[PDB]
Subunit: 254 residues, 8 copies
C-alpha cells in the first residue's frame, strides 16, 4: 500500500518541507522515558534533539516577523498530534519562551493526561464564561510552560471556535505569551483545525509515517491551505528506527 | 459508468473545488437521526460534521467580503438539493448567523415538509402581494432560522422570480438576514435556479454521486455560469460509505 | 450524412452556445396543444419550459445593457424560425415585457397564421405609408403581446428593409416596446436577415436538427457575423424525443 | 482540375471572402428572364437575390465609411465581368443609390449592348474632350441608373485612363453619384483595370468557376493588390447548379 | 540545366516581383513589326500591352513619391536590356511623360541603332564637355521621347559615371524630364550599372528566360542591392510562346 | 558507492563551489607534522597550502564587503569540522587577521585538545555569566589567534545559543576580531549549527569524501539554507591522495 | 580539398562578403599586359574591370562616411596581397582620388618592384627620422598615385609601426590623401598587419583560392577582428578561369 | 590521454582565445639561441615573432583603457610560465615600453637565472623592508627592461602578497613603469597567483601543450576567474614543430 513514509514522499506528494522526524519511541532514542514528555524527562536524547530541530525550523520558515502561534494538526486520528504538540511546547519553554499549549480538541482531549492535570475548567468553560481566565490556565512544573486544557466537552465545539469569545481570548493570549501551540482534532474529521488556522495563520502538519493514505493527507493539506494560512511544513512521526543515519544518532561523550 | 463518482471526477470533469462529501445516510453516520434534518436532530453526527465543513469552506472560498446568500441547485431532481439546503441552513444558524432559508422551488416545494411548517402563505403569495412579509416568513423552533416557505404552486413560477417584487423582497432579505439560502428546482429542467443565481451571484452545486450523467452535469454547470454567478463549488451527495475514511470517523 | 444534430455538434462546428433545444412537438412535452403556440396554450409544459430557458439565456448572453431586440433566423426554409419566434415572444410577454413580434418575412409570412390575424396591413404597408402606425400593429388576446404582421407582399422587400422608413420605424419601436422579435426569411436564401441584423445587433440562430447541411449553417453564421451584429447563440429545433435527460422532463406534482 | 471550383478553393487559393455565387443561368434561377440584365428583368429571381447578397456584403466588408466606387475585373475574358457589373449596378439603384456604371472597357465594350444604348459618344470621347459630360452620360429607363458608355474604341485606351482628364472626370463622378461601378478588360491581359483600381481603391474580383486556371487567377490577384486597392472579395460565376442548396431556393 | 525560367523561379530564387514578361518576338504578339520598337510600330499588340503592364507596376512598386528614373540592367550580355529599355521608354512617352532614354552603355551602345540616330555626340562627349547639352540630346519622331545616345567610346567609362559631371547632368536631367531610363552594361561584367544605381535608387532587372545561370542572376541582384538602391522587380524576357494563358492573348474586336 | 567522492559530485549533487580539497594526511603532504594543527606545525606543507587556498577563495566568494565570521559544519561527526576550523583559523591569523576561534560544540568539544588549552572556563560559563569575557577567551602561542573554548558541557547547549547573552557576546566579538570561526556539532544531529549560522549568515560546509551518504549530505545543505545563511561552499576532506595532481606538489 | 575554393566557401567558412574575384592571369583576361600592374597597363581588361568592382563595392560596404584607408592582408605569403594593393591603388587614382600606397611590408617589400621605383628612402627611414616626408613619398607616372616605399629593411619592423612617429605620420597621411592603401606581410606570420589595421579600422582580406588551408584562413580572420578593425570583405585571387562566367566577358 | 593540445582544444575546453603559440624551441624557429631569451638574442626569429603576436593581442584584448600589468600563470609546474614571461617582457621593452618583469615566485624563482642576476635582494626583502627600492630593482643590458627578482625565499610568501606592503609597491610600480609582468607559481599548487591577480585584474594563462590534464587546466581557469580578474587568453607553449602552417614560417629575404 501507498502511503507517506519518508522525507522524499512528502516532497513528492505534498510539495512541502519536513520540519523534523520522530522516530517511534524506543528505549535508545528516549534514554528510557516513562511518560511521552521526552523533552522534559530525557532532554539530552536524540528524539528530544529532533524536537529542537522542529522548533528552529519553525522560526526559520518565516523571517521578517517572528511566528508567535501554530496549529498542530493532521489528516487523521492517532497520528501523534497531541504528542508532537506537548514536546514541542516543552522545547519552546526550555528556550525561554513563555509558552502556552492550548488544548483545542474539545472532543477527545489528551493534553490533560499528557501533563496530568485536572480538566474541570479549560478552553470550553473559558469561552462560555463558566470559568475565569486566571483559574482556567494552569502553570505546570515545567518552567515557562502553561497549559489551557480543553475544559468540559461542549455540545457545539466548532461554533465555540468561530466566536468573538475565541477571537478575544486569542488576542489576550498573544499579549501574555511569546509562543502559542494549539492542539486540534484531525482536519479530515472535523472542521475545527481550519477555524483555528484562520486565527494563527501558521499550521504544522503531522503525518503518521506508519499508517496513512496518501490522498487524505493530500486533502488535509488542501483543507488547511483553503483557510489561507501558511502550512509551515511537516513533522513525520512514528518513523522506523533506521537509525544508521545520524539525524538519529546521539551526540555527546557517553 | 459515465457518472461523476468522486472528487477526482469533479476536478477532471468540471474543474471545481469540492466543498464537502455527504455519504448515503445510515444509522451510524447520522447517529440514529429520525428525520433528514440531521444537523438539528443529531448535531454531533459525522454527516453533520461534514455540513460544518461545507459551512466552513463556503466562507473561505470567497475571502475579503462575506458570502451573504447562496443558491442550491443540481442538474436533476432527487439529488439532495433540498436536504443540503436545509441542513446547511441549520449549520449556519448554529454558527450564530441570523439565517433565512427560502423555498424557491414553487413547483415541487419540500421545505415545509422538512421543517414541518404550514404552507398556506409563503414566497408566491408574498410576491403576488396576497400576504404580508411578516405573515410569510416563519420563525422555527431552531434558534436563528426563519423559513420562507414556497406558498401555493403559482401558475407562473419563473415570471414571479424576475418580477420587481422579488428584487424588492431580495434587497429586503439582505437587510434582514446575515445569510440567505435559496433551495431551487433542478437547473436543467426549468430556469428558476438561473434567475435566483443572478441575484445571489453565488451558487453551491449539488451532484448526486450515486446516479448522474456526466454531460448533463457539466451542462448545469454552464447554465449557472451563464448567469455570471460564482460557483463556489460542488457538494457530493449519496457518497458510497468509505467510512475508512477518517473523513467519516465518529470523534468521539 | 453529416449534419448538426446536438449540442456538441454546435460546439464543434459553429463555436457558439446553444440557448435551448426544442424537442419535436409530441403529445407529452406539449400536454397536447392544438396550435403551435405552446407557451400560450400549455404554459407549464416542458417545451414551454425550454422557451423560458431561451428567454433567460438571451438576457444572460449580454450584461452591461439589456438586449431589447433580436433577429431570429436560420440557414434554410422550414427550420422553425417562425415557430421559435412566436413562442419566444409569448414567453417574453408572460414575464411582463411589452413585446412586439414583427413579421419581417415579406415573402412567405407565417406570423399571421400562427396568431390567426388579418394581414391587410402590416410592415410592408407601414413602410410604404399605405397604412397607419395604430392600425398596422395589432394587440392579441395574449397580454402584453402585439404583432406587426408582414403586410401585403411587396415587390422589393429587401429594399424596404434598408430604408430610412425602416430605420425610423425601428427607432419608434424601441421607445414603445421593452422587447422586439423580428422573424426573418432564411439567411442563405435572401439577404433580408442581414439587413435586419444591422439594426438589432443581436441575432438568434435556429438550426433544424432533423435536417441540415453542416456547411450551409456554417455560411449562415458567417453571413450574420459579416454585419457585425452579435450571434447570441443557437436554438436547436426539432430535437429527437430522448427524453431520458431532464432537460426534457416535466417538473411539478402530477 | 486546377480550377478554383467553389468557396473552399477561394479561401485556400487566394485567402479571400466570397461575396456571392452566381450559378449558370437557367429558366428557373433567372425565372425566365429574356436578357442577361436579370436584376431588372426578373427582380425576384434567385440569381437576382444573390446579387442583392453581393450588394449587401460589399457594404459590410468595409464598415465605418461607405464604399463609393468599385472596379469589376477578372483574370480572363468571358468570366462574367460585364454581366456582374451591370446587374450589380441595377441592384444598387433599386436600393435607391444614385448609381453610375462606366464602361471602362474601351477595347471590347459591352455595356451599350447590355443596356441597349447608343455608343457614339461616351468615356473615350469625353476624355479626348470631343463630347460633353452631359452628352456622354445617359439616363436609362431604370430609375437611378446612368450609363457612361465606352465611346468609340480609342487608339490608346490605358493612356487615356492615366490622363489628367480622367482624374478630373473621376472626382466629378464622385461628386455626382452615390455609387460608381467600373467594368474593365481582364486584368492579366492589359493594365486598364489596374489603373481604374488605383482610383477606386476598391475591387470586386470575378472568378469564373466553370473555366479558370488557378495560377492565372492568383496572378490577377497580385496585379490588383499591387495597386494598393482593396480586394473586397470574389464573385463566383457560372457555378454548377447545386440548387439543393437553400442558397438557391425560390422563396416564394 | 537549372536556370530561371518563369515567374515561380523568380519568386523562389530572387524573392522579387515580376513586373512583366516579354514573350520572344514572333509574328503574332507583335502584329509583325520590322524594328524591335514594338510599342511604337504595333501599339495595340500583346507584347506592347506587356510593356504597359511594366510601366504601371513600376509606378505601383513605390507609392508616397513618384519614381522619376530607373536603371535597367541584367546579369549578362544579350539578355534584352536595351530592347526592354527602348520599348519601355516609348510606353512612358505614349502616356504623356516627357521621357529621356539615356544610353549609359559606353562600351557596346545599341540605343543609337534601335532608334536609328547618329552617335557623334552623346553622354560621353557631354560629360567630357566635348559637346553641348542642346546638341547632345536628340528629339525623336516619337512625341515626348528624347534620346541621349552614348557618344564616342571613352577610355574610362566607369570613371565618367562617378563624376560631379554626371551628378550634375543627372540633376539637370530630373528638372527637364518626367521620366529617365538609363540603359546600362551587364552588372556582372562591369561595375557601371552599380554606379548608375547609386543616383537613381531604383533598378529594373532583366532576366533572359531562355539563357541564364541561376547563381549569376543571384550575384547581379546582390551587386545592385549592395548600392542601397531599390530593385523594383524583374522583367522576364524571351519567354516561350505559351500562349494559352492570357496574359499573352490579344484583346479587341479583330 | 552513494558517496560524494570528488568535486564533480559536489557540483552535481549540491550545486556548490568547492573551496578546497584536503587529502588524507600522510607524512609527505603534512611534511611530517606531529599534530593535526598543520598550518602551524608545517606552514609550508601542501595540506597547509591548500588551507591558504580555502582562505583565499572564501574571501573571493563574497566580493564587495568582507566576510567577518563563518560557521564550520558537516552532515556527520568525524568529518573534519574541528580540524578544518582550527587550521583555517591559523591560516587567517598568518594573514594578519585578528582571529577568534569559538568552540560552539558544547557537547563534544575538541578545540581545547587541538590547541592544548585548559577548558575550565569558556563559552558555556561565559554565557551563563559564571566567568568573565577576558577570563574566557585565551590568547594562544600563535600570533593573532584567540580561542574561546567550549567551557563545561552545559545541560542545555542550543538554548544557550539562542539566548540574549550569545547575541550580546556575538556583537561584542564582531567589534573585537577581524575574523571569527565557529566550530559546531554536525548539523543533521542537533540544531546548534543552525543557530550559529543565523548569526553569521556565512557557512563553510565540510564533506568527508572518504565516508558519506549523499542524501544525508544534501539534507545538511537544506538545513543550513533554511537559516537564510550563505553556503560559501564545500571543503572536501580525506580526499584520496591523487598527489598526481599538481594540486598537491611540494613547491619547493 | 580543405581549400576555400569559391564565394560559397567564403560565405560558409567565414561569413564575409566577397568584394570581387581575380582570376589566374592569362593573355585574354589581362589583355596582353606586360606587367602585373594591369589596371594601368591594360585598363580595359576584364581583370581590371573586376578591380573597379572591388573599388566600387569597397565604397558601398560602408555607407554614410567614406572609407579613407585600408589594409590589405592575407593569411599566407604569395596570395596576391601586394598585387591587389597596387592595382586597387591604380583603380582608385583613375577614379580621381588623390591616392597613396604605403609598403607596410618592411620585411619583404615589393611595391618598389611593382612601380619600378628606387627604395633608398621610404617608410622605415621616414619613421627613424633619417629622411624627410617629401623625400620619402614619390609621385609616379600615374596621375594621382604616390608611393611610400618600404625603405631599407629595419631591424625592428613592428616596433616601428606602434611608434609615435607612425601615429603622427598616419594622421598626416589622412590630411593629405583621399585614400591610403597599406600593403602588409601576412597576418598569421607577423603582427605588422594587425598594427596597421588598428589605425585604419578597415581591412580588405585576400584569400588565394588556388592554394590555402581553410583553418589558417579563419585564423587570419580572428587575428584581424581582434584589432577591432572592420573586415570590409574578401578578395578571391587566382580563381580558376570560369570565363563562362559573364563575370569575365570582354565587353567590348 | 586527453589533454589540450592545440587551439581548437582551448576553444572547446576553456572557451578562451589563444593569444599565441610557442613552438618547442628547436634550432630553426630560434635561429639557434643559447639562452632562452629568444626575443633578445634572435629577434627576427619566428618564435620571437610569436611573442610579438602575444604582445599585440594583449593590447587588443582590452580597448577603452591600456592594460598596464599582467599575471602570467598556469595550472602546473614547468609549463613555461617563466620563459613566456621573460620573452614577453623583452618584447614589451623592444616596443619602447618601460618594462618591469617581477618575479612573484618566492618559492622556486627562476627569473634571476633567465636574466642571470644576483638574487640577494628582490621582492621578498623589498616587502619586508630588508632592502631598498633603488637597490632591489635592477636595470638589465636590455634597454627599457628592469627586473625585480624574487629576493630570499621567505617563510610566508602568500601573506607577503596580501599585504599593504605589496599594495603599496604595486601602486608605486604603476607610476614608474608602462608595463608590469608578474611571474607567479602554478595556480593549482599555491594560492599566490590568485592574490597577484586581485591587483592586476588581467591574467595571461600558459598551457603546456605537451603535458597537461584537461580538468586541472579547467580548475586553474576557475581559480583565476574566482578573483574577478580578466583572463585575457591563453598562450599554448611547447607546441609541436608542424611547421607547415605559417604561423610558424620565417618571413624575410634569406
Ligand atoms: Mg490530538
Ligand atoms: Mg428540492
Ligand atoms: Mg420564417
Ligand atoms: Mg466585359
Ligand atoms: Mg544593353
Ligand atoms: Mg568537531
Ligand atoms: Mg606582399
Ligand atoms: Mg614560473
Amino acid at each position: 500500500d501507498k502511503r507517506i513514509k519518508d522525507e522524499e514522499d512528502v516532497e513528492k506528494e505534498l510539495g512541502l518541507p519536513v520540519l523534523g522526524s520522530i522516530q517511534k519511541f524506543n528505549m535508545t532514542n528516549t534514554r528510557r522515558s516513562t511518560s511521552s514528555l521526552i523533552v522534559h524527562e530525557q532532554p539530552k536524547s536524540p528524539i528530544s534533539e529532533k524536537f529542537r530541530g522542529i522548533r528552529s525550523n519553525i522560526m526559520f520558515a518565516n523571517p521578517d516577523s517572528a511566528v508567535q502561534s501554530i496549529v498542530i494538526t493532521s489528516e487523521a486520528p492517532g497520528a501523534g498530534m497531541s504528542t508532537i504538540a506537548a514536546n514541542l511546547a516543552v522545547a519552546y519553554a526550555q528556550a525561554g519562551y513563555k509558552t502556552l499549549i492550548v488544548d483545542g480538541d474539545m472532543r477527545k482531549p489528551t493534553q490533560h493526561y499528557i501533563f496530568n492535570l485536572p480538566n474541570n475548567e479549560g478552553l470550553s468553560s473559558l469561552l462560555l464564561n463558566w470559568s475565569t481566565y486566571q483559574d482556567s490556565i494552569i502553570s505546570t512544573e515545567i518552567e515557562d510552560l502553561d497549559v489551557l486544557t480543553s475544559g468540559p466537552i461542549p455540545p457545539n465545539p466548532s461554533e465555540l471556535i468561530t466566536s468573538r469569545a475565541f477571537a478575544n481570548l486569542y488576542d489576550t493570549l498573544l499579549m501574555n505569551y511569546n509562543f502559542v501551540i494549539i492542539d486540534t482534532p484531525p482536519v479530515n474529521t472535523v472542521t475545527d483545525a481550519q477555524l483555528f488556522s484562520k486565527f494563527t495563520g501558521n499550521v504544522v502538519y503531522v503525518v503518521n509515517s506508519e499508517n496513512n493514505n496518501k490522498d487524505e493527507v493530500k486533502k488535509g493539506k488542501e483543507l488547511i491551505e483553503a483557510t489561507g494560512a501558511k502550512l509551515l511544513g511537516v513533522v513525520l512521526n512514528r518513523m522506523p528506527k533506521d537509525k544508521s543515519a545520524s539525524y538519529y544518532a546521539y551526540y555527546g561523550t557517553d
